[PDB]
Design a binder for these strands. Structure first.
Length: 183
DNA sequence: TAGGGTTAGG
């Protein structure tokens, strides 16, 4: 049995009239829903326009994501890997991005090392191992861009990543300015 | 379009 967090998808952009029932009826097409709910105001009971669906297995989750775009109650919605309440605190945790920051990679790390680990998550468009433009010294971090934002989401929700023999930290890439506003 | 009375007590 895989962890609940990894078996759940956040469903954003829900139609004003989507319900626990209409949501379920749609996503059950890709698996056994162990949970399905529409978040709404506790006071007015008005829909907050988003919800979650949870499958019995991550394979069923992958099936659902491979079926995008998803239209529910006539509205195109936005299914996303569910980011934990804890991680939802980090800056840009909910951004739709196709690039990741990979920090703490050994000096002798080469592109093939990155591909050997990251290709399993999706089509890689660009790989950039950073160096100091002036000294030419390796800075110990890289950037990897994918063709699908879900590749990035599938990655950052995992805790560990082994590249060139050792663990490395992987986060959603924030722009120069986002990093600044994040400081 | 970020969570459902779901987060520090001898």
């Amino acid at each position: 049995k895989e962890p609940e967090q990894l078996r759940k998808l956040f469903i954003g952009g829900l139609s004003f009239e989507t319900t626990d029932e209409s949501l379920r009826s749609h996503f059950e097409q890709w698996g056994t829903l162990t949970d399905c709910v529409v978040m709404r105001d506790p006071n007015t009971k008005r829909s907050r326009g988003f919800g979650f669906v949870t499958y019995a297995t991550v394979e069923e989750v992958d099936a659902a994501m491979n079926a995008r775009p998803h239209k529910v109650d006539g509205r195109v919605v936005e299914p996303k890997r569910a980011v934990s309440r804890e991680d939802s605190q980090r800056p840009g945790a909910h951004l739709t991005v196709k690039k990741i920051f990979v920090g703490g990679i050994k000096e002798d790390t080469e592109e093939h090392h990155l591909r050997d680990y990251f290709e399993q998550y999706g089509k890689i468009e660009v790989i950039e191992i950073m160096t100091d433009r002036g000294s030419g010294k390796k800075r110990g971090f890289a950037f990897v861009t994918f063709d699908d934002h879900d590749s990035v989401d599938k990655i950052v929700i995992q805790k560990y990543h082994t590249v060139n023999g050792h663990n490395c930290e992987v986060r959603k890439a924030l722009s120069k300015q986002e990093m600044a506003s994040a400081s």
